[PDB]
Amino acid sequence: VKQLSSNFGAISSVLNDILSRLDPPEAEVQIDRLITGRLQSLQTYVTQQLIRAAEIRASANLAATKMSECVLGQSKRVDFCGKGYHLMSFPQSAPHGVVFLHVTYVPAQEKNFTTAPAICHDGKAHFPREGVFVSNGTHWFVTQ
Amino acid sequence: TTEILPVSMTKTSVDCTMYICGDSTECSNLLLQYGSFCTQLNRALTGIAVEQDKNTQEVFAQVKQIYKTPPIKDFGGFNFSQILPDPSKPSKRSPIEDLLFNKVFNGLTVLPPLLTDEMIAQYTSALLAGTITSGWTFGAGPALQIPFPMQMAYRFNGIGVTQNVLYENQKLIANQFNSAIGKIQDSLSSALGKLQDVVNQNAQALNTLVKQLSSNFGAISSVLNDILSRLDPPEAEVQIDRLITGRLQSLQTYVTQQLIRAAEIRASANLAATKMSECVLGQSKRVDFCGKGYHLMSFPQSAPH
Amino acid sequence: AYTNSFTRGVYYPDKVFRSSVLHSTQDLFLPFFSNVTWFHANPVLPFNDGVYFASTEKSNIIRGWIFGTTLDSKTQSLLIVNNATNVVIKVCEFQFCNDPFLGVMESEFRVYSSANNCTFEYVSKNLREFVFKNIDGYFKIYSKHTPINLVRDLPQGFSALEPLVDLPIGINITRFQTLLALHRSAYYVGYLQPRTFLLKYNENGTITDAV
Amino acid sequence: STNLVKNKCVNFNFTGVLTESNKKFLPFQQFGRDIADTTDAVRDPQTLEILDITPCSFGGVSVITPGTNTSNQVAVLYQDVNCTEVPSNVFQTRAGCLIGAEHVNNSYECDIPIGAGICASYQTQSIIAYTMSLGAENSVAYSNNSIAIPTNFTISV
Amino acid sequence: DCALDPLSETKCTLKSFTVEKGIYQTSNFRVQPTESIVRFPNITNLCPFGEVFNATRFASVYAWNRKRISNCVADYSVLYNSASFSTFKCYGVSPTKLNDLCFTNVYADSFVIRGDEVRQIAPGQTGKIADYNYKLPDDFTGCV
């Protein structure tokens, strides 16, 4: 809008100032200047709107994928639906967008123990089915 | 295998008046009639200059602490000396990183990246030290230290194969990994066209912008000291305005094409971020997302941009 | 006989200094690999769009060249003479003979018999390339004195003719001949063509290579 | 007019600082030029020597403020300009010259980005500058056969 | 007042009274390029204008003699202040500052015409003079 008050090398910025104190033959040469200017500015606006729309589009596409994969799923992907281990998500709207609440599980309060991949017994090697072999300092124990 | 991903390009700033007028009041006074084209141009160039840094921070800054490796290094068969930071090297970089950075005027200014090459190298050293010692635990909270053989048994379980297969084949998997990292050095030395292309594109665009300052566009000369030193102000306006329109057009074209290139560097940086999250901060079951085959682990190394 | 130039007659369009760049220009340049008329020591040759003149000789046989329209009186004629002393340039209506030359005692000078209406008057092995050109009455001569290891044969290599004299007289040159020293006690003729040349320069400003 | 004004951005009638050179020439060269017809040198018309015509000194000016709702103090960066030709605290940065901010030796998280590793903050009274912190530092207890296991936990959103 | 301090200039750039935290380009710094000096070798002479101007006689438009009057001080300031010539028609260049303007070579097409045939000679407009006697090309860069 603020471009509508520039001469661009014209003699006013009003078309009721160029037909106006000037005469129709010389009026073309001052109207065309205004026309070129205003066309340029309108084109620039439209190109920049295309360039901004291309980015709102990528944002919306990520929003779509994540609603597929975090509300409507549980995601094993690392750092796609929060930080930690993904449990669930909830969407909430926002004026021109969406916010999501990421519910994740975070482990805490570690304790260092000793291990080994394997246990020998009766001449055989045993490996844990779904855990790890830890020791309390004496007896060996399987944990998740 | 390797893969090259451009994350940033050069941040440039143009002084509209200094590119079109070149310190001449007559031109500067004629330029004011065009309104705020020069303001919209500076805005657009600042708007891409800032996002170039944002790309960098969203790719590399995925760690809270600066992890360091133990001084005594026994990884049960894996020797990672070619990808660890070397103290006697420039910028405390890794041997592989060394090879990567060896392979690849008038209102015109280039802004330095907020982040130096040293700090990117330290981000990588942190990520690397975290993955070789704690596995994927540091990417979900506490860095629980695990023996490297145990970590490799879990990634084997992750691809469906039993742990005994790694435990009875430790020394061979060891040698094959070492030999496969041995070929990377030579394969890269004999590769980073992705990176070379973005630099070449930005260079050619700057070069065309400067070369446009020697065209008349329908004027009598290309110098403002050849229309003010050779003609009275009345008739000079009808020749300066010609140079003005043409230089505005060329500047606008450059900025539009820079916005279009920035949109594509953004997409590349976003895929680098997602992949760092899925392939070094975790193990991807995604077919062909972190390599060809069954993904085991990834390791980031830095390249100029 | 005819011969084949390889990369010859590549003069500096003009002055300003240029460091190692590939400035592409477009001037009257003898096209790369042209057909140079091999002469031996002569008849009047046309001037047309400039004349390339490679001279391969040790003893001074080429004793200057005559230039002009009718190469005689009624119309002015640019005579460039070279003697045991120095160069005598003269644009006057002369009386050039059918064979304008000089003898070698040292009794010489038979070129002409008259010298009326004298507007311009100036007075003062080894391959000698020369480029003549009268654009807008400006006789820009270009020269390259590069010592060869042959006798009278065109060598293979590159040479950047450095601009020499420019005569602002304004004479119609449509023909030209060669003054030679006779005995009392081989040159090459090419024609320049509008040619686009990617001129590769050096940090010292020298055209080291061209395309 | 006068004689050679070596090393001065001057308007010459043979603008730019009249630095000198040591290049050669071929007996005729008039002035000097380079890529995109940029007058980068000249066969000096009088003493027949080479002088490099470097364009005049120039650069953007950036204003760092902690916000008018916190303070009205301001810091100024002259972009990629040597801090000796600007016209307290003057501090030289790979990104130009910074005036109005004192350089400290701590490292914090980045607040206002200057560049080349440098950020600025309204902390230490006045504007201060520093090399930003990548982060804190966690060490590890790796041996060859020792594991850590979490005992309690936390749900986060 | 947009020229007091950096903060006021920042306010003026943003067109606001509350600036939030960030970093804002505000203006440019340009070292003064003054002391205009002349290294041009002075010609220190005088171009004989009157000789090729108002002489004893002139030529016709069929045999106009172009006199090369150059390599001297071209004082056109004295021609302008004398104003003894009805027309000056400087097409291509400025005739007021033609004295200081330094060219490489200047001509002097000397001929006489009628008062109606003085308009005929023109860069573009053809006629009994500019198409049959003395033709003035459109690249005219001198002064009639």
Side-chain angles (χ1 to χ4, degrees), chain A, chain B, chain C, chain D, chain E residues 1-38 40-144:
Chain A
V1 180
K2 195 212 60 194
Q3 287 295 285
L4 282 192
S5 86
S6 310
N7 310 337
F8 290 63
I11 53 180
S12 55
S13 300
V14 186
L15 274 295
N16 287 10
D17 293 358
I18 183 51
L19 275 298
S20 75
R21 45 234 186 178
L22 244 211
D23 61 312
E26 288 68 344
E28 301 184 333
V29 188
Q30 299 294 308
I31 297 169
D32 63 358
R33 175 51 259 172
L34 280 193
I35 302 302
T36 66
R38 272 61 190 290
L39 275 297
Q40 293 179 356
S41 187
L42 183 62
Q43 296 294 322
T44 295
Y45 175 88
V46 175
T47 290
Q48 289 213 297
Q49 284 288 281
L50 294 174
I51 288 179
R52 190 32 166 138
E55 306 328 310
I56 290 286
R57 178 72 182 164
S59 189
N61 275 347
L62 301 203
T65 290
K66 183 176 72 68
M67 184 178 73
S68 67
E69 212 57 42
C70 315
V71 74
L72 312 182
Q74 199 198 6
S75 195
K76 302 296 293 291
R77 314 291 63 75
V78 178
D79 290 2
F80 183 70
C81 311
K83 181 68 168 176
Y85 299 121
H86 184 236
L87 296 179
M88 156 175 65
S89 300
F90 309 118
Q92 282 313 250
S93 296
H96 293 90
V98 59
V99 176
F100 294 90
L101 303 188
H102 288 306
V103 181
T104 62
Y105 181 84
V106 188
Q109 280 165 51
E110 46 254 40
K111 244 120 248 112
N112 174 236
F113 303 110
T114 188
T115 69
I119 302 304
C120 175
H121 186 93
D122 280 13
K124 293 185 292 294
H126 312 256
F127 308 96
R129 267 172 204 198
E130 69 272 14
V132 297
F133 292 133
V134 328
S135 211
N136 73 303
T138 18
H139 350 281
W140 281 79
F141 291 115
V142 294
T143 66
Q144 201 285 328
Chain B
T1 61
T2 79
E3 52 167 2
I4 308 100
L5 276 106
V7 302
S8 161
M9 55 182 195
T10 46
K11 306 101 189 136
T12 64
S13 176
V14 181
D15 300 325
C16 202
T17 310
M18 218 24 74
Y19 172 81
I20 292 141
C21 293
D23 276 310
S24 54
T25 63
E26 307 96 341
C27 171
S28 202
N29 275 254
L30 275 189
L31 187 51
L32 266 186
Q33 307 199 69
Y34 286 80
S36 62
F37 282 144
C38 293
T39 290
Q40 107 201 324
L41 281 173
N42 292 135
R43 193 261 292 133
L45 283 183
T46 60
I48 58 165
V50 291
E51 303 305 272
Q52 292 326 288
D53 277 345
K54 274 78 181 167
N55 290 345
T56 283
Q57 279 86 255
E58 290 301 351
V59 182
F60 323 112
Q62 276 181 28
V63 198
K64 273 80 59 188
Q65 286 91 224
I66 300 298
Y67 294 102
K68 287 223 314 288
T69 53
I72 49 165
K73 313 183 31 139
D74 47 322
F75 299 123
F78 308 90
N79 226 305
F80 286 95
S81 66
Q82 279 77 221
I83 66 152
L84 69 91
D86 185 84
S88 65
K89 265 193 202 307
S91 186
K92 300 297 182 277
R93 59 196 318 163
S94 118
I96 285 304
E97 200 182 337
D98 196 358
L99 305 174
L100 302 170
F101 275 64
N102 80 35
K103 286 165 222 139
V104 292
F105 282 112
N106 27 38
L108 293 206
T109 303
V110 167
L111 291 194
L114 175 66
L115 225 137
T116 70
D117 281 316
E118 211 281 321
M119 317 157 111
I120 274 167
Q122 294 320 102
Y123 281 145
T124 68
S125 78
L127 286 149
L128 259 309
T131 189
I132 298 168
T133 326
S134 96
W136 55 98
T137 65
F138 79 111
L144 318 161
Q145 61 267 338
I146 76 215
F148 212 56
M150 203 36 152
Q151 189 190 128
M152 197 104 185
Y154 282 22
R155 80 170 23 100
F156 264 43
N157 194 4
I159 70 160
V161 64
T162 64
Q163 290 188 337
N164 63 3
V165 172
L166 170 96
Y167 286 125
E168 294 186 350
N169 297 320
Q170 188 55 80
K171 63 209 63 59
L172 59 100
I173 291 151
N175 305 324
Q176 279 114 49
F177 170 82
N178 185 82
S179 155
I181 303 288
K183 66 98 197 167
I184 293 204
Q185 335 154 349
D186 347 302
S187 85
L188 278 187
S189 298
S190 51
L192 328 165
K194 340 221 188 135
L195 192 37
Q196 198 60 68
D197 284 10
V198 55
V199 177
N200 287 344
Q201 193 270 329
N202 174 252
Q204 62 84 33
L206 193 139
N207 291 130
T208 195
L209 188 61
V210 184
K211 213 218 24 215
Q212 283 298 287
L213 273 192
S214 68
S215 320
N216 314 334
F217 286 78
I220 48 193
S221 58
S222 300
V223 193
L224 264 302
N225 281 8
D226 276 6
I227 183 46
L228 268 342
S229 93
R230 279 186 353 203
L231 246 202
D232 51 342
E235 275 97 324
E237 300 183 329
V238 197
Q239 300 296 315
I240 301 166
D241 69 351
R242 187 44 252 175
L243 285 182
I244 299 339
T245 54
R247 265 68 183 280
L248 254 317
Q249 284 174 7
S250 186
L251 195 41
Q252 297 283 347
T253 299
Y254 174 81
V255 174
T256 290
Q257 289 216 293
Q258 277 293 281
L259 292 164
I260 289 172
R261 196 37 178 125
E264 301 335 295
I265 286 291
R266 181 62 187 168
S268 182
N270 276 346
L271 295 200
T274 292
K275 223 225 15 97
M276 178 134 127
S277 99
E278 223 37 63
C279 321
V280 68
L281 293 202
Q283 202 195 6
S284 201
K285 306 281 304 290
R286 303 302 49 66
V287 184
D288 302 2
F289 182 61
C290 333
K292 188 57 165 180
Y294 298 122
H295 182 236
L296 295 182
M297 190 162 31
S298 292
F299 300 120
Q301 282 292 283
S302 312
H305 291 92
Chain C
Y2 294 155
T3 316
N4 163 73
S5 63
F6 313 92
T7 54
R8 298 292 183 184
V10 204
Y11 57 94
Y12 297 79
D14 53 356
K15 300 73 169 160
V16 161
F17 190 64
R18 251 109 16 154
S19 285
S20 336
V21 294
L22 311 151
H23 181 31
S24 206
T25 68
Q26 222 269 319
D27 219 12
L28 263 183
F29 288 131
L30 187 102
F32 267 177
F33 286 94
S34 258
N35 217 23
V36 249
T37 321
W38 197 2
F39 269 89
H40 268 273
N42 273 25
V44 206
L45 289 129
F47 185 86
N48 57 82
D49 249 331
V51 162
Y52 173 65
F53 208 94
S55 290
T56 24
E57 230 131 17
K58 196 62 131 177
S59 81
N60 271 78
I61 299 302
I62 324 270
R63 292 306 194 95
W65 325 270
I66 55 175
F67 289 96
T69 345
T70 73
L71 246 336
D72 238 22
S73 256
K74 137 215 64 250
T75 333
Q76 313 233 231
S77 288
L78 155 71
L79 153 107
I80 310 203
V81 113
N82 211 3
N83 304 326
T85 14
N86 263 294
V87 217
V88 189
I89 296 184
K90 226 182 309 234
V91 193
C92 317
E93 322 223 323
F94 293 115
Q95 240 328 288
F96 295 128
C97 313
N98 278 138
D99 221 6
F101 60 83
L102 40 129
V104 109
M105 328 244 262
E106 274 135 47
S107 356
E108 59 107 22
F109 222 108
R110 100 106 124 175
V111 204
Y112 47 80
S113 314
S114 288
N116 17 93
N117 313 312
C118 270
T119 19
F120 192 91
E121 160 80 276
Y122 156 80
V123 76
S124 240
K125 317 290 120 255
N126 348 275
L127 153 78
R128 333 185 119 102
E129 330 199 320
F130 291 109
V131 163
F132 312 120
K133 228 156 86 112
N134 200 64
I135 316 247
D136 301 322
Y138 269 168
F139 206 67
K140 302 153 313 304
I141 315 202
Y142 307 90
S143 165
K144 222 14 206 316
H145 291 308
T146 139
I148 38 133
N149 239 5
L150 246 352
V151 240
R152 33 206 241 185
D153 322 82
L154 195 70
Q156 180 141 15
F158 193 84
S159 244
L161 282 93
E162 290 163 76
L164 223 77
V165 229
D166 178 35
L167 318 165
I169 161 81
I171 174 237
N172 265 1
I173 330 244
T174 68
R175 244 168 37 224
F176 102 102
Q177 217 217 252
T178 310
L179 314 176
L180 296 153
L182 226 99
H183 26 73
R184 298 301 155 125
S185 190
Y187 62 88
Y188 290 84
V189 170
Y191 297 124
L192 317 159
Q193 259 88 62
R195 267 308 236 253
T196 149
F197 263 55
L198 199 74
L199 255 23
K200 166 187 255 179
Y201 284 90
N202 208 62
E203 22 156 80
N204 314 317
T206 121
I207 312 175
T208 71
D209 189 359
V211 165
Chain D
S1 207
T2 86
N3 63 297
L4 264 165
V5 224
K6 302 291 219 142
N7 321 101
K8 225 240 118 232
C9 249
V10 99
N11 320 289
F12 34 81
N13 289 295
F14 283 161
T15 189
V17 87
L18 287 199
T19 100
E20 22 256 80
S21 201
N22 33 269
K23 246 116 68 232
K24 259 72 58 80
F25 103 132
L26 282 321
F28 55 91
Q29 269 136 19
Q30 256 274 91
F31 322 120
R33 234 121 275 164
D34 235 34
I35 7 111
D37 231 36
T38 49
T39 316
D40 75 310
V42 261
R43 180 62 178 189
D44 201 2
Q46 293 229 304
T47 180
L48 259 233
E49 62 137 324
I50 312 301
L51 285 76
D52 291 290
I53 298 180
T54 51
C56 290
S57 164
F58 64 93
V61 178
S62 308
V63 163
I64 303 107
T65 292
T68 71
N69 190 18
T70 294
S71 171
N72 285 251
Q73 310 184 64
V74 172
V76 175
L77 174 83
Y78 296 79
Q79 308 204 55
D80 66 1
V81 167
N82 199 354
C83 199
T84 306
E85 60 184 5
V86 165
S88 175
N89 304 125
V90 304
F91 169 47
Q92 182 83 58
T93 308
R94 181 68 180 273
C97 164
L98 192 58
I99 306 168
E102 49 163 310
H103 187 228
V104 304
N105 191 322
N106 308 76
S107 290
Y108 313 84
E109 184 178 1
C110 193
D111 292 331
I112 301 162
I114 304 304
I118 309 291
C119 308
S121 78
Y122 182 67
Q123 180 195 298
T124 299
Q125 272 83 68
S126 62
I127 307 290
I128 67 169
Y130 45 83
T131 305
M132 40 189 170
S133 171
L134 295 197
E137 304 79 6
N138 174 229
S139 21
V140 85
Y142 176 68
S143 41
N144 56 286
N145 62 299
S146 205
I147 199 71
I149 301 145
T151 64
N152 221 339
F153 58 98
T154 308
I155 304 311
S156 83
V157 61
Chain E
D1 174 11
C2 302
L4 206 60
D5 52 6
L7 196 74
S8 308
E9 209 176 21
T10 291
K11 283 178 185 162
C12 200
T13 301
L14 296 175
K15 293 193 46 58
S16 171
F17 275 52
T18 61
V19 176
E20 61 178 5
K21 58 173 308 200
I23 192 167
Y24 292 164
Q25 174 79 328
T26 294
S27 67
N28 290 316
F29 182 76
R30 284 301 171 281
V31 162
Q32 273 310 296
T34 55
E35 313 305 297
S36 326
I37 32 96
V38 196
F40 254 121
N42 28 81
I43 350 107
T44 15
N45 234 70
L46 215 261
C47 287
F49 280 116
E51 168 247 343
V52 262
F53 262 62
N54 357 73
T56 141
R57 258 128 141 196
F58 242 10
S60 211
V61 241
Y62 97 102
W64 44 275
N65 0 81
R66 19 187 22 160
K67 154 73 180 338
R68 197 104 257 180
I69 171 207
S70 333
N71 234 144
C72 33
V73 166
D75 216 75
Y76 287 89
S77 32
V78 80
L79 262 11
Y80 234 64
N81 61 57
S82 87
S84 23
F85 336 103
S86 23
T87 264
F88 238 104
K89 245 219 351 119
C90 282
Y91 273 22
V93 281
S94 247
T96 329
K97 41 120 235 80
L98 220 41
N99 165 55
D100 40 275
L101 203 215
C102 199
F103 1 90
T104 73
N105 50 338
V106 2
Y107 251 149
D109 319 332
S110 137
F111 50 87
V112 283
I113 31 210
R114 277 165 193 155
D116 81 282
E117 305 210 65
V118 89
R119 147 239 126 243
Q120 226 133 36
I121 148 216
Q125 186 247 112
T126 108
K128 223 28 99 172
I129 304 301
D131 228 18
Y132 258 10
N133 266 98
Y134 163 76
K135 205 140 153 354
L136 196 38
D138 289 65
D139 36 88
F140 184 42
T141 19
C143 296
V144 162

